[PDB]
């Protein structure tokens, strides 16, 4: 359903946030 | 649906957060 | 609808968080 | 509605998070 | 209602995130 | 209900985010 | 339910965010 799909898009965007934070982790380690 | 669309706007805003975090990682690199 | 409108407030708030993160990025450059 | 007003409480806490992030930026100068 | 109460729990958890971010700011100050 | 319970899981996850942020603050203090 | 399962996916992504932040803490150590 459309509400379920939109929520899934929210979860995907949150994963993108996790990845960007890992990029920050690596930047600090560099 | 309006609830679905609103949720999709939340997903989009979360993507902007992930981008902002990339700018932070970039500021750290250089 | 009030539920949709409240969700849009949440998206707006998340955008403000994105802009604040960019302020963090800017401060790290400087 | 109780559900809408709870969502508004969520929006308000998110604004508090944005302000805290601004405080971090300020700390960094 | 149980759904509204759960949303209130989310709001409270987010407040805790704000406080932890304030802690980070304090740490950066000195 | 399953929706209320899932929202509570989200609240719990947000609390883990707050704690991780406190870890970041601790690391910054040495 | 599909709505509940999607919200559970949101919870798991948030946990991934908590873990990424832990890695940032470790990096700062």
């Amino acid at each position: 359903g459309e509400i379920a799909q939109a929520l899934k898009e929210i979860a995907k965007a949150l994963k993108e946030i996790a990845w960007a934070l890992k990029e920050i982790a690596q930047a600090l380690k560099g």
Side-chain angles (χ1 to χ4, degrees), chain A residues 4-17:
Chain A
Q5 299 324 122
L7 290 166
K8 286 176 167 177
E9 283 177 42
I10 288 175
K12 289 199 161 324
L14 287 165
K15 289 203 189 293
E16 290 183 31
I17 287 173

